[PDB]
Paper text:
Here, we present a cryo-electron microscopy (cryo-EM) analysis of the mammalian Eag voltage-dependent K+ (Kv) channel in lipid membrane vesicles with a voltage generated across the membrane using K+ ion gradients in the presence of valinomycin. The Eag K+ channel was chosen for study because its pore is gated by both membrane voltage and intracellular Ca2+ through separate molecular mechanisms. Four voltage sensors inside the membrane regulate the gate in response to membrane voltage, while four calmodulin subunits in the cytoplasm regulate the gate by closing it in the presence of Ca2+ (18). Voltage-dependent ion channels contain structural domains called voltage sensors that control pore opening by membrane voltage.
The intermediate and down maps (no symmetry) arise from the class with a more heterogeneous voltage sensor and have overall resolutions of 4.9 Å and 5.4 Å, respectively. The intermediate and down maps are less well defined, no doubt due to conformational heterogeneity. In the intermediate map, the position of S4 is in between that in the up and down maps, the bend in S4 near the cytoplasmic surface is still apparent, and arginine density is visible below, inside, and above the gating-charge transfer center. These features constrain K1 and R2 to lie above F261, R3 to be in the gating-charge transfer center, and R4 and R5 to be positioned below the gating-charge transfer center, thus corresponding to the net movement of one arginine or one helical turn (∼5 Å). As expected, the pore is closed in the intermediate and down conformations.
Author numbering:
A (entry chain D), B (entry chain C): 10 to 406, 412 to 696, 704 to 722
Write the structure that this text describes.
Amino acid sequence: LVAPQNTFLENIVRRSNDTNFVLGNAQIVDWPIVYSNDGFCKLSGYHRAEVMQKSSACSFMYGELTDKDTVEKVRQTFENYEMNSFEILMYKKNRTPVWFFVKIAPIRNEQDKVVLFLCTFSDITAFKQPIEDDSCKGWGKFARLTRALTSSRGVLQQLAPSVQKGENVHKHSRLAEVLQLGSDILPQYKQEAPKTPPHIILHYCVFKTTWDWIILILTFYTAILVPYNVSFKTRQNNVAWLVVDSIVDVIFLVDIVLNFHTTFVGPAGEVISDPKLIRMNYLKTWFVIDLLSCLPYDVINAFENVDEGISSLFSSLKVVRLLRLGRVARKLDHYIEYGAAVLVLLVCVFGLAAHWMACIWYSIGDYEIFDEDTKTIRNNSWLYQLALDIGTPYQFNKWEGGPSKNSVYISSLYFTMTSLTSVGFGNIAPSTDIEKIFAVAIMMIGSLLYATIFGNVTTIFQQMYANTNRYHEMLNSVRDFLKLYQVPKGLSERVMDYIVSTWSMSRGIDTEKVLQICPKDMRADICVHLNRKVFKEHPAFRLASDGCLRALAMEFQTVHCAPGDLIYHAGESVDSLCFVVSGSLEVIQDDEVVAILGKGDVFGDVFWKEATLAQSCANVRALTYCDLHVIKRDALQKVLEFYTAFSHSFSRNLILTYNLRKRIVFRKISDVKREEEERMKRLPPDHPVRRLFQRFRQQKE
Amino acid sequence: LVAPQNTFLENIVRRSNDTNFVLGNAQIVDWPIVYSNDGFCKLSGYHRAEVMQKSSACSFMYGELTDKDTVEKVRQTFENYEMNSFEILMYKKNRTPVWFFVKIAPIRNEQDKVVLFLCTFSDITAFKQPIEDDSCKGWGKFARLTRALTSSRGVLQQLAPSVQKGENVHKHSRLAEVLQLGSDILPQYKQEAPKTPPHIILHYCVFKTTWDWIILILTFYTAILVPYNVSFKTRQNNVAWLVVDSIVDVIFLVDIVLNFHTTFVGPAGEVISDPKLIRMNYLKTWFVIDLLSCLPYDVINAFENVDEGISSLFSSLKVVRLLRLGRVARKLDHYIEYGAAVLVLLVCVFGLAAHWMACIWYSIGDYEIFDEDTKTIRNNSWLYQLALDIGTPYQFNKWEGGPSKNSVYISSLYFTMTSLTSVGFGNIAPSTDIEKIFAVAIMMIGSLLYATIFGNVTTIFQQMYANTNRYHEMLNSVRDFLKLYQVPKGLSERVMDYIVSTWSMSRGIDTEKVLQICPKDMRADICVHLNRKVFKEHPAFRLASDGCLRALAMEFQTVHCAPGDLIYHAGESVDSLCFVVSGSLEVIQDDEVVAILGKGDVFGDVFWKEATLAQSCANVRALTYCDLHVIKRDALQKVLEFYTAFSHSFSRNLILTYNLRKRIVFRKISDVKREEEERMKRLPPDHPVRRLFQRFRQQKE
């Protein structure tokens, strides 16, 4: 989410440290100036526009005291493209001769070419010999030159008055700030994305995504396992549990380390990648909590110490890595956001709450069943009830254990579960006060959890139906309109066929909306792409310029059509030129076929010549599914008159297939036979019709 | 929700009591008139427009009989800004000389300045000596003057014919209505919000809001506690319950008093704050109910009287303060309305209904268990069943009590609860007829309550997803369109990058919609703010007037762009001026870099000079993320020709960085070397090409 960016001006101005620079082209003869810094503009007194395009040699800066040897040296250093520095008198706009130190640095290109020359300048007037062509006084001229030397007199040499013979180090101090420009020359005219530090890996790499999926699976597995072991306090018989616990805790610590070594996205900035601040930000935000939550705290339980009862609660506290997950959810859900991702999040929280409240019901029962050394059986307890139900009742002499831990686990799970979805079988009763308060807490939280899933599942029916409903409402309105206004079957089915076909090919595409969203130049490129067919195939466009091509692409509109469609009916005013790129067309003149139109054909009229609109002499009808491109007369004329140069070539190259303004005369064989046989079968009062004949002859004259 | 308002005209006209007044400026020499009342307009006969801007001295009113002493007195009283009153003959528009009483009152300003002079006038003709320059008759002139004196003859002196020598009090009666104007002078030209009475406190103060939160918590606590004590009829063992009950009832009475002393909002008026009506409105609407509901009625139970069984039902009746809360809800919910406030309202009504129906189930059981002195155990009762289930069965000799009240409370709560959410454990059965009807009532109301929460929770998924769905549908349509029309990868990713970046930076912002919602002047201010950058930094605008600045701000449009974007391709018609405020730009001429554009640069053409559009000679492309401001030629020309004065300064100050109409010529070093080595390696039939050469020379001539 970043563009190949160029930063040369900002980089060079920031590296300059209040110095000045001038830029000029390398490959053009005499190397014209392409840029001048504001500092140079003010130092020379000449404006940027008047220094623009001038020669890099700065001959326009020269004066009588300039050195032909220096001129030759700058000339040959330009012609050989090496780094150098110089010292020479130069003339300001007031034609005051003043001293200058100069350095040159041509800049290479990413293509290993060399494109640019870079210049730097500095005053040394207050330190060189005094010179004055004309002055009010020698001391006054000295003071004025020293006050002009403020650039050197500033931070670059502010310590000078505390020392003597400072010129032994002032030259090097000035030269270092220009020698630093070698780093500025590095990008070599290239515009490119900035770099990021190593050992901090981009968060969006596929390897990091599968790492995120792995830590997902790990935290889900730990959230399963933890409440089980902590509730039942089972014996550590197989070392595998401790092995898995320690490895998964250390892999979580490594995950925290990679968050400490990975890119992060902030609300105030699209990408944040500086190690010097990302680590501290991650710390101060959430890294302290991550450290508080993700260590292998079970090592304390594995070891032995005087910390009686201190470290027990670590397991549920470290389950919370689901909260790291929830922070990641903002991104990770979007891989299934299409698909209602929250469905899995629901299922997971269901399972988690079920297991949690299973262990809670177990804990309450276990705490209640025996009344300590008082030996009160408390037969009212649910666990006693289930023990007697399943058999193997308790005994004493000593105590019998009755039910087994596995069966009792599933007992608790199943009660939690039935409470969760309100089926309430009722075989296992919450007899005691605290059992029965816990029943409050569980079924309340269950109902709140329960409402959400109905909302979630309803959230998809809009997608599943509303599009069809939009189609349905337009179709129903069309039906009512069409039937209400009594359109016969032919035109009615033509209308509905057009509606259904165009809707099938379109649906949700808003092509005009996409166009107007698109910015002007990309719009130009899109329409050029869409009219590429006619542009390449028709020879009239083989000569066009890119600008006129773009404008014509804006103007062009493409029409698909069904067979039997009538494009130009007789007597209609022709106003458009049109091309055929698919299908075929036919022309009807006086109910007679006179022309057929195929691929690549173009017909219309010479608008640029006639300049007057005319009626259509014939009818043109489709016989195939055809694609056509049409152009309006006025816009075509405007583009043509703007591009007069292309206009002449376009006029002389373009030839039409048929011209709608002209028409042909003909005779039918049947009509000729009728006339011949009528002649085979074959006036003084006709003076009025003869007068009409004479009038017609005069009009035709 | 009120603006700093001015009411001087309405206030003074209402205080005037049918008198007249005239206003004039204080700080302008000769004090021109700024306003004239309609009464004065009609009394003088001169129209408002012709009296406008005239001198406050009313010299244009004067006549031969006027007094130079009075003229000097009004002059010096104006020059010294004191209050005074006067009497003088003046002339009406018909040039009839008539008597006038006059009073003057300059008005101060909120800045302790003085800005305005106020005048008042009145006729005394019928009481002063008779005067007539020319008349039909003396008695007729007397009658006409008396009929002109109707202003004094009206309500100000209507009692005069019942008295004699009334002039001893008529002057004071007239003067009082003008002396009242001192209160009218109070606001001192200031426009400000009106005042509200003390001891009635604004309802929206933060202290009042936290008071509302406190009364919320109090009524919630009382609603918890009341059905418990009233159902179980527990002994009053700790005085703390009575203490809390009495303090909370009296704090509710104090709350009712503060509603009686606080602002209230009515549908017919945005703010209602008059004590003389707000108290009565609050009374007649709801204050009678508040008094009916909020007293410490438990004092009767604490005391002793012959009122056997009268005062018991007070507690549930005073719980209803949740209805005061519900009236407040219209406002109070909106602090959590963002956040689906109704969720807490649900949770609260849940808890309330649970506890209520707990106490109801308890009441039914307690009423049923024992069949009075008949000693029928009624073992069918649910409470008997639970007693035998838990143990400690009932006994007699005398009666054993069995279950304890705490356990029985939670029993009832828990049954109500399981009935509420239909889990229906079934261990506690409604055996008896009435138990079992109550089961009807509870589970019916439970299902009605239950449906609401699903609606509530579904109400959020639109917010959670529909925005993403809008983005999804446009992206899907773009994908289908782009792939269907076979755009290569380069342009395809350019398009999708533009779409996603613009959508990320925009989302729900409809900037154009905000603009068109905004009214014209604030639109002007917004665009001035947005173009402040160019306005302040570019010297050409340092001279502009506010009106032309506003119009140009309306015209300006800003464009952000990505690197590689081509603004003006070669051969395109230049029609816009444009400025650079961010990033950098580069210019390509004949595939050669010729110019670079930086911060603050401007390029285009001199439209106001050339007046003819021209094609672009070069190409300009972006290398950085850049922000630009563009101006259309036609609107710029129109604004300039309107503001001709600024036009000359703008033309003479403005200088372009590069002009698209002009172009540069150059040569390549490689091309020069090729030509030189070709010359190192180096016509009669050429007459046709020589003729072309001669034609070219003639055309260039």
